[PDB]
Design a protein around this ligand. Structure first.
Ligand SMILES: [Ca+2]
Ligand SMILES: [Ca+2]
Ligand SMILES: [Ca+2]
Ligand SMILES: [Ca+2]
Ligand SMILES: [Ca+2]
Ligand SMILES: [Ca+2]
Ligand SMILES: [Ca+2]
Ligand SMILES: [Ca+2]
Ligand SMILES: [Ca+2]
Ligand SMILES: [Ca+2]
Ligand SMILES: [Zn+2]
Ligand SMILES: [Zn+2]
Ligand SMILES: [Zn+2]
Ligand SMILES: [Zn+2]
Ligand SMILES: [Zn+2]
Ligand SMILES: [Zn+2]
Ligand SMILES: [Zn+2]
Lengths: 414, 393, 404
């Protein structure tokens, strides 16, 4: 809970919690305040439960895109680092921890998709998407393919579609304009067109998923793939002489991958907000702190400028940061749920031929507002029923509103 | 019974309708136009039924908050008192009778919660909320409690919550901005926290409702309660030496109770709009008009400045007008229905520990703004339902 | 089919498609490119289905209001006629073919309601609505009625209602503000009030529909009726000595009838965008082009200034254009579905006495918006049912294609 006089930290099991515990000991040595690090199962699901009743950890570690939902439910304390501390980190990461004007977390690490290439098949990676078709028929002559990446998930296909001017929601002040959606502009249109052309000219298969794209690259069957820092360990094992580099340009514009930021938030119910802020600002977000965490489990690229420059000596890490700098910070707003489902269908339908490019993307725009507001209404029936639970004396699994009558007037009058 | 050459007035049975008929005989004397006053059952429900077909009274009396829904359905005629008539009343009472720029009703009487205290247990009432925890323990030593009021309805708990900067919807031009909700700001957050602190520090019970809060004050078991002019008649009966005063301040700010304004609206279907406006401006909203109504039933505080000053000699009425002047005029808009159910759940959950202050209020701004889809959904279903039952049968 | 190297044109079967095919042969003579005009059943429903999968015609002919939904679904190619070609047509017709700033089609013909009168019963038609009461009494003495028109649908009753300031959605920049509805203002209030007054003063029956209104005018029972260019051929057969003129003014303001504009849109999937724009701009939208189409089946008033002035020799056509120029261009946006349903009820309720004018209108202004927001949420539940269609199929293409 609160944990008055101490600090309890939740961080996912797959991270460097042992390294974080070691910063905890260093903090315990100069202050006498003991730090407890734990990694419960599905802590991103548990936090919304316990924090709503004033319990839980003092500080939570998760990808920034979950925090928008938390801050909306008032579960995170507004943080106030002064200007001096802010300049210690990359200015773009602060934009990943801002919910409606307010700063609600500290950025730790940075993730983004990169171009991963087989050095032995490709001496040098293309700087340009446009030259991939030419490159594929050069490698096909050797029974090899140029590129294979997951086409089923928008996360992977977005970098291209967004390249010439697409975007999820327009951001211009720490606040996302939810009626300015850019899935239906000329830039996005140009991007998805190129992608569909790649599939229909047989340079790519419409059924390529994560597993198939990973198996092909790790068996040296394909020259290139698009993936993030979590996929590297498997390529090390495959013994593929691989490189990680900046994504290819399209129509002269860099690709725009989604940027996910590991963030540290303070529970709005913690009485140890001061302790937590001193721990994060002066012990963890330091070269010595991140180093200790990194040693246990690599963070990839980090938000702190000083330690990032030390980690950039690895050209894989330097490439993940450079991609992220030219990429699009993933909106933390609830309307993103709609965007995922809409663009998923728009890409799958354009790819298979079921729909055209212009139609698939135009339908997504409508599906964005339609599915997005639906979530607001779904919360209304879910809050009206929830009020009834606490009034009388899984269970909420009800949800009626099934009256959508379609009036079809007979416009005959001849 | 469309009227035509006569005035038929509607007003609730609990009001000075016999005093109103006395002004209606006065009008009949200088005009030869007979005034009929009636008080049918659930008139506030019947009025929208009959007015939508072009029937019912020429003029209607009810709290200003119901008038928003009426004027939205276009059942009220616009009124035009000139600059001279408007300055006879308190400026703020005109803000209660404004529906999207247009004035639709004449303000009559003003209602707000006040601090009612036992003079025999409390010499001077506390000017400050912050000092009540200290006053309770001083009274717990004697087997008494400092304060007990209804914690179940947000009408009673709002004064405190809104004190430091909370508000329902932002008003700034005879028009409410329905996207500017103030249940989740630092003002509301500071207020509700204080209220919950009281409950967990056992200066208050989470299960205190209207009945329990009234019983306790009327048996002298508690030194203070918060209530309105309607409860006065029961405290007289209990023989408690009581006082009515301005509500305590919080963080230096005055408490902000909701303001209910009893108002007179003219039926849009009434052929007697001119007669009505003459009766209301020149006969009823005068010292003698309101007196006649008041002698039948007390209005409490009144909108007319002149007659308010004569009534102000009662310190109970004097405090009601002070509280109402520092309070918030209850929005007349349909989005208020959402506000009631959401803030009500928010306070209940915060008090019982089921949810924190920050969490209950942040999810209150969702429930209240998200119940607006009910407005469009339930109104669109229900709207189309009427046409279904007409086209299909 | 596909289209590559030719043109395929879709137009409704009640138009001059043979005359359109005749423009098609003239094009084929100078170019060699074959033009195939076809008129399939319910083509305005078939077009969204085939155009979404990249099929259908190169060019499509329909009333402009249907194109909003097409351009929203991205089924129409943005057209670019230069300032020189744009000035050959009436400026107001271009506004009927703008979807959110972009031009999506070519204007062909214009259609609006007009006052149609029996010159044997009425020598000179009234310029004023206000005088129809007095005129009725004068004709009632002879066992005739002054005016009889379809009161059931708003399309017909709108001209009056809108006359003094009523409007569907405010339009100011090729873009409709859907929060600015005008069915509740003083203008609309005044118009419907006048209509209600006519019905309760028994100058008009609340149950007059299209069929009753048409029969009455064509049996010489009523002196006047409002209607459009489509009802003319029935009046010719009735042997009624009739005229067609400008609609009566209310409170000194002209009646605002809804403007329907026949339009030519280019499929965004068509490989022959340059061919189609060459056909339309320089072969069809010319004196000789529309003339060939007109001779097969009349277009009524036309968007091209030059040929319109030759057609204006007919006073009927000259008046359809004059009514259209003072009227309101029908919004092409999806919120118009809700507009029709809300105003249809509002009028029927106010006329039957079931509701007052103030109530029935202020209900419509809230109802039309309430259905509009539902419309978006219905293309949602159904669009989530594309998962039912798809996610079931890609599971049966996976359980069935791996035949157990
Ligand atoms: Ca624990
Ligand atoms: Ca500092
Ligand atoms: Ca170092
Ligand atoms: Ca080192
Ligand atoms: Ca390790
Ligand atoms: Ca009666
Ligand atoms: Ca005066
Ligand atoms: Ca004492
Ligand atoms: Ca009495
Ligand atoms: Ca065919
Ligand atoms: Zn664990
Ligand atoms: Zn190729
Ligand atoms: Zn140190
Ligand atoms: Zn009664
Ligand atoms: Zn205490
Ligand atoms: Zn046919
Ligand atoms: Zn008459």
């Amino acid at each position: 809970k609160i944990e008055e006089g101490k600090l309890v930290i939740w961080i996912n099991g797959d991270k460097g919690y042992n390294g974080l515990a070691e910063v905890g000991k260093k903090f315990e040595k100069d202050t006498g305040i003991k730090v407890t690090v734990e990694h419960p199962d599905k802590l991103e699901e548990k936090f919304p439960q316990v924090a709503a009743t004033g319990d839980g950890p003092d500080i939570i570690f998760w990808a920034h895109d979950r925090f928008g939902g938390y801050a909306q439910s008032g579960l995170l304390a507004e943080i106030t680092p002064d200007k001096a501390f802010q300049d210690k980190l990359y200015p773009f990461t602060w934009d990943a921890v801002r919910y409606n004007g307010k700063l609600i977390a500290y950025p730790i690490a940075v993730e983004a998709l990169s171009l991963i290439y087989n050095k032995d098949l490709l001496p040098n990676p293309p700087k340009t998407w446009e030259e991939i078709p030419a490159l594929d028929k050069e490698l096909k002559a050797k029974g090899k393919s140029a590129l294979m990446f997951n086409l089923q998930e928008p996360y992977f296909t977005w970098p291209l579609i967004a390249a010439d001017g697409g975007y999820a929601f327009k951001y211009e002040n720490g606040k996302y304009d939810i009626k300015d959606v850019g899935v239906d502009n000329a830039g996005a249109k140009a991007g998805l067109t190129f992608l569909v052309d790649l599939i229909k000219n047989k340079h790519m298969n419409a059924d390529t998923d994560y597993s198939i794209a990973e198996a092909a690259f790790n068996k040296g069957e394909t020259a290139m793939t698009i993936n993030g820092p979590w996929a590297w360990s498997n390529i090390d094992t495959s013994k593929v002489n691989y490189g990680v580099t900046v994504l290819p340009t399209f129509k002269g514009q860099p690709s725009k991958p989604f940027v996910g930021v590991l963030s540290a938030g303070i529970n709005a119910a913690s009485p140890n907000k001061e302790l937590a802020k001193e721990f994060l600002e002066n012990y963890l977000l330091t070269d010595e702190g991140l180093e200790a965490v990194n040693k246990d489990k690599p963070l990839g690229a980090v938000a702190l400028k000083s330690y990032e420059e030390e980690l950039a000596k690895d050209p894989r890490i330097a490439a993940t940061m450079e991609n992220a700098q030219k990429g699009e910070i993933m909106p933390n707003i609830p309307q993103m749920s709609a965007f995922w489902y809409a663009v998923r269908t728009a890409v799958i339908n354009a790819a298979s031929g079921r729909q055209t490019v212009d139609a698939a993307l135009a339908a997504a725009q409508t599906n964005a507002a339609a599915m997005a507001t639906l979530e607001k209404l779904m919360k209304a029936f879910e809050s009206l029923k929830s009020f009834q639970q606490q009034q009388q004396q899984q269970q909420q699994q009800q949800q009626p509103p099934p009256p959508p009558p379609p009036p079809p007037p007979p416009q005959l009058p001849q």
